[PDB]
Amino acid sequence: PVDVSVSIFINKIYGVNTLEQTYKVDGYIVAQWTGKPRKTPGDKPLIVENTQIERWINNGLWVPALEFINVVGSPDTGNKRLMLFPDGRVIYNARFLGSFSNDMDFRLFPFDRQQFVLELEPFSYNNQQLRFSDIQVYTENIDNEEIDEWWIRGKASTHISDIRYDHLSSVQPNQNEFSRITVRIDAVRNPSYYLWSFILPLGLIIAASWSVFWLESFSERLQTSFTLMLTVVAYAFYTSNILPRLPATTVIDQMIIAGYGSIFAAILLIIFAHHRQANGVEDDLLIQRCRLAFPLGFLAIGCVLVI
Amino acid sequence: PVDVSVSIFINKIYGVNTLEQTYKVDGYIVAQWTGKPRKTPGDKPLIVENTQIERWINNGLWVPALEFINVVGSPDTGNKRLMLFPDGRVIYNARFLGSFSNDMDFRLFPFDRQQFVLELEPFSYNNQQLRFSDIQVYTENIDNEEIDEWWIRGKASTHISDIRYDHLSSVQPNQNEFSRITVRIDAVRNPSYYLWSFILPLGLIIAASWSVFWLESFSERLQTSFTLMLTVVAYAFYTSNILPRLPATTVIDQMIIAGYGSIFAAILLIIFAHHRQANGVEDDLLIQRCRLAFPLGFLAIGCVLVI
Amino acid sequence: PVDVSVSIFINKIYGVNTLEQTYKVDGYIVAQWTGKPRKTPGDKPLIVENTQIERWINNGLWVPALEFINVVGSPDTGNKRLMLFPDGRVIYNARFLGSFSNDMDFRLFPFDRQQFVLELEPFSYNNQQLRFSDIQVYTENIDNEEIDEWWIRGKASTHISDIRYDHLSSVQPNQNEFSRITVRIDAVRNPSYYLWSFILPLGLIIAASWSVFWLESFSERLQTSFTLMLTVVAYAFYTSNILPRLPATTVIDQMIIAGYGSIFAAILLIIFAHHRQANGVEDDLLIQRCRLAFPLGFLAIGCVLVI
Amino acid sequence: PVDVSVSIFINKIYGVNTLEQTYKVDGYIVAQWTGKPRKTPGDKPLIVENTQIERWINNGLWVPALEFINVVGSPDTGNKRLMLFPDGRVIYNARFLGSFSNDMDFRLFPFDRQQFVLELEPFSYNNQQLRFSDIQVYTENIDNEEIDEWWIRGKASTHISDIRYDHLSSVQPNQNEFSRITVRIDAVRNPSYYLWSFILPLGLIIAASWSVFWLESFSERLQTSFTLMLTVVAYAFYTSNILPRLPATTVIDQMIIAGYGSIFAAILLIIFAHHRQANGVEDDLLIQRCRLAFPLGFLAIGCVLVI
């Protein structure tokens, strides 16, 4: 079994797609192993670049294919090189930009946290072993973080493991285990932007909707609610169109639904106070009571939301 | 007739396009057959990867081209390999990402269910038979389902068949039947998100629209109706822009049309009650009757919608 | 002149682009001609697939290039094969997906009808003739039609013709006529969806806008119009954003403009009735007259729209 | 200096990108020059197509690369051919689809006019001269123009010139002038659609906004303005989202700004008339005066806009 040492340099993780749970990773991949020694020009290591690489493979050079397991579509490989050492060492180095898949739960949207993973595995060989994996995710940790959209927490975690494929041929007596390198980078979303421009105004609207009870007439109370109703519909549209697209109910989507309910409940109470008492009494002890209670009931339900 | 065994590993089915009735399928395809025995290095099976494969084809190796019948544009094939066995067996294995087509009826949008199908067929040979198809759609069934957008019902069903092409040449006396593998995966859309964030507020708005009859004056009743009218127009826009795009009337689209009608009918009744009675009587037995009847008429019509 | 028989199988016509007047066509293309006889393996027809085809062309095999005249960008060709017959026949078969152009007038948008055309022509040869064209547009005609977006009317029409290119070289004495195959498929748009979810609510709003005349006060009449004004602005936005994009005025766009005018004319009449009569008379014989007349004037102008 | 005669057939100019000032050009390019005579099959001109062309170049055939100077990314070339004449003539013909750049001023958006240009230049040779350029922009001039989005004014203008590159090597004593072909096609946008569906309603809204002065009460006058304000905000959104995107203020954008100002100026006058006169007088000679003057002040300022 050939010992393969890999190194993955991650330049940038960007372009997260919430609809398809994917993310882009730009960087380099280096893999080193030792083969039979070789006569090189003079005796310095020989450099073979791009189109010249397949010329060496056609003459018999063994270059194993390593596949990104969780990639989404063939990645864009930039420059690639082979470094052929006279003592037998071989170093493959290539620039790449690829889109990778991982299970991503966005339910607690503004305050959610995700981990971006890479999964590397040889495409055809089980008799060849990944010896050690070093990733160099040397993007900043203390340069721009409050300004940046995602907060990387710690240095990336690595784990070389062995994957057992059962459904295989019938001629392999026991060779159905492959070496898989797994890189993981944990990150937390910076909610600053979504707090100020989305959650804050949504609170301001939800709060100010309760000021309908400070209207004197019943006609004033009920008719204004329909203008508040339209405002929440507008704000829900503004929220869903500008924020990333999701077929899942987010924290903000609960806040939106809560606002929807708060207005509908107000309409019920406003009509209730009118027609609850005999002979047209307006239950003024209700309008004034919920004038402060209605704000409190929402805050109590919000805490049980975090139950 | 050559016996070819295929195996299709489905990693992920995603990216449904409602406008073009397409869907993306990432996974692997394996095909195995037995040919004339062959001298391999030593005597272990030889592995030929990617660019090296066409070198073997130029020297005479027979590798049939299998076409995805229902594919939408040439798919993106990642790494590919040939496993050449000394006794004659040949195993082709390739990673692919492709877009596939099938008839998809989205009319009952939030609660609809679809089946994703693959159709495999040799491109040039009828004297070569697909012997058995095993698909490994080992995506979860009981890990994430309530969180996931689609619910896979069962393991994929397959069907190898023979397709008769009539319009052909004139030199084939009887050989116009091709082996077609057909894989089918049934799935049900998870309506959780669309119920809470779309159907529920639409109900709350439609319901609260009936509270126009609880206004005392006629001027209050008619003018408020026009503000409710704007809200339904606003909500239909929010609905059509955020939800997947469709040139077909969906369940939600019927609910939207229903809200449109409920408001217009209210305006008729509101105006009717004013000018229906002689000498300016306001038919107060109507406003109060439909105050509860108008909500009920909508519920009765909704049940005949499910007829 | 070489006799070339073509056959075009049309799997699917989809993805009409109203902004660029284009549409996608998936299917196969077959071309057959007879050349000098040939020694084949044994004596069965030889099959040459994909990358192996250019190998035969480099050894001298004459394979003419057929260009889609009205294609938009080089089309995506899937699998391709050559079938070489010993008696001299040669059959080229290839799967393709391409985007094609044709003049498409969408002015009567919901009820418009278009025809999708293909135009085939050899790229370099005029001394080579397309002998007969058979298209197999065996998409359904009586399976799904009311559910489908477009209605195909009849079997596709074909026409081989001769195109005269004048601006050419100076060395051709008379050879400037090329063989062109022209396929035409006529189709009518299914207006069901646009009627119910777009045309119907637009009528309901336009109609209900006239109910402003049933308000008793003049202040009620004028102020309500401005809320109705906003509703038409809102509905025009919803219409233009969801419906296909066009730099041309459609039937719906005329209906929208009509709604704009109906409201502006209402504001004129409402203000006119106030200040038309001496000493502050409110011309109540106008408000009630146009209470019914204003709806009729719209219907009369709508019929002259179809003039 | 080799004499190269080019001819550019322009099939369609479409896909104007206002954000990036680009446009797509589909058509053919032909280039002819005379070289050393050649032994051809028999003695008829030889046709070399697509993949076969580079075979002749590897054997020594001189085929110069002509670059589209103003192209945006490598263009999509369809079929290409070489016609090798026995007397030495060589004719290169190729189908192409490319995106081209030019400075485009969209400030007078609905009524603007642009010119689409192509710039052709050899990539490596200054000792080779473009002898004459004939373009065949035989798209219609009198077939569909009122229906079409753009109006082509005349046949395209050509200009072969010499471009002086100063910053070059140090070994060229005087050879730093290159032959550049420049094609120009002038076009005027058909404003019919934008007039009816955008400019017309914006006028109606701006006009109808002035009808606020016909309200009797002061409370009626001020409150309605905010509904008209919302209408202009709504209409500004509808305008910017559907119309092509631009980081420049257009004619329509000025009309929008004008509507914003008309309403804001109205609010000032409405509040001014209330509190301008001593003892609470409502300056009724103002409300009625600007009832007609405010429309005129807008019309007077609009004519100074065309100053």
Next chain:
Amino acid sequence: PVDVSVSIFINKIYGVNTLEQTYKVDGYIVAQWTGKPRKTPGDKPLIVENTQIERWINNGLWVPALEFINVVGSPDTGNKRLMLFPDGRVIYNARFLGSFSNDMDFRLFPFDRQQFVLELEPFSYNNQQLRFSDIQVYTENIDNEEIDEWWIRGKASTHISDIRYDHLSSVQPNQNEFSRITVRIDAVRNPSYYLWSFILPLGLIIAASWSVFWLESFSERLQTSFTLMLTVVAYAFYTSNILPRLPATTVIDQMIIAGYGSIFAAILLIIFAHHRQANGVEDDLLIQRCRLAFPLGFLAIGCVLVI
């Protein structure tokens, strides 16, 4: 160490992507060095174009690969050429369009300024030195600037430097320093468009919101605020949808949030003035005081924003 002279011609910098902090660069790259002398046809420098270049590399020609460090995906290279001089000089020249990455802070959006940078580095050699970098950013400086979206300030800055890579192999005793060319072009965004069509109406709306205090009744004051509330929600949507997309709070977003706060504070003051005084007094000295003070308080807070 080989001396390599590069020259970078920048035709156009366009397509800034605010979400991914990228920008497109179209232009040419020229690189010159001197090698062992060479026998050329006759003795003039030989020109080798495109596909013919790799033929010389297969025969042994050394052409080093230079990589754009900050590129986002492999760039699109148009025509490329080699100029082989008899005395040993070699000139590589290629057209390219590429997407490049750099840290871009858009927080002060309308008035922000950015710098577009390129970073060039050899892919495999440290024993080869970039001798001098000359960029020709000969885009206009005094032709169109007020009309153009970006303002280039000065001639582009260059800096050849040495980058120390630590994490490397174990066989290099001291050779881990690479030559990096860094080009920088400073640019300031032209805020003209965003001022007139976005900042100005936002001011007009924010200002006119203060006119709620000039209403006489309390019911008029509170109900109108909710219509003003909806207008800001609409305008926030229009702002975020049309302006470039950003997960960061911009100057406009602060102006938007300020408008949100201004209205909510008014609702508090409007309700405060009602219920602050004993026995139902309406604190008319507040409504009139903040009638002018509320405008001033916003202006006072706005200057401390620029603190």
